[PDB]
Amino acid sequence: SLALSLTADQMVSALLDAEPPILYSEYDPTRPFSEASMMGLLTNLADRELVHMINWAKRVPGFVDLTLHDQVHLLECAWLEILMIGLVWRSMEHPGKLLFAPNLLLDRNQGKCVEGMVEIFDMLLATSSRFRMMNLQGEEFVCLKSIILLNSGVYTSLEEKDHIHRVLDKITDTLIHLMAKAGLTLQQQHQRLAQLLLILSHIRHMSNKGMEHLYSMKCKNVVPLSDLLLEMLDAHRL
């Protein structure tokens, strides 16, 4: 296993090199908005991002060492979390707005166009402001995103959860290595590490709420959701 032999800088280098691209939406600023059309734009974007996320997950150190059914499970549990932390990351320098795509920048008043959105919208904005106040770094972001993939489904004969916990420990070593490299004292390192992992608790909360909203939109059968998005959504209803 090459993942457990990577130095901290090698861990950062591999995660940065595996980053997926930032995709564009099909948003036309002259086509008038309908709550169904904004949903269609966001679910179309999420569907195309899922293909890149699957191949980004293959390039996460240690992920390939898992069985195919374990990979399927981790992605099923974590896909919306990873989309969300990616959303709030690229929205950091856009206070009060969410950058879904470079051509799709929404503020609060446009989230209320779709029902039940306001609360998910506000929590995403608060997470992004929290990242901006902490001056979250890209190297810390790619570490956090990999932790979500490996940790979000590590619970829900084959003691391969043990190997996952070893990779997670290596990423914690990588986070500490970065913070020391940035001049933080020992006390500051443990505190910032705790502050970052506590955000993940709220990203789980946002994903749980966002999954309930997505499922309701499927039942209202008003927005076309891709077959991949159905199966990912079906994996949380079950």
Partner: peptide
């Protein structure tokens, strides 16, 4: 299973 298929590629 689409995810299984794409992961398998």
């Amino acid at each position: 299973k689409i995810l299984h298929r794409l992961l398998q590629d």
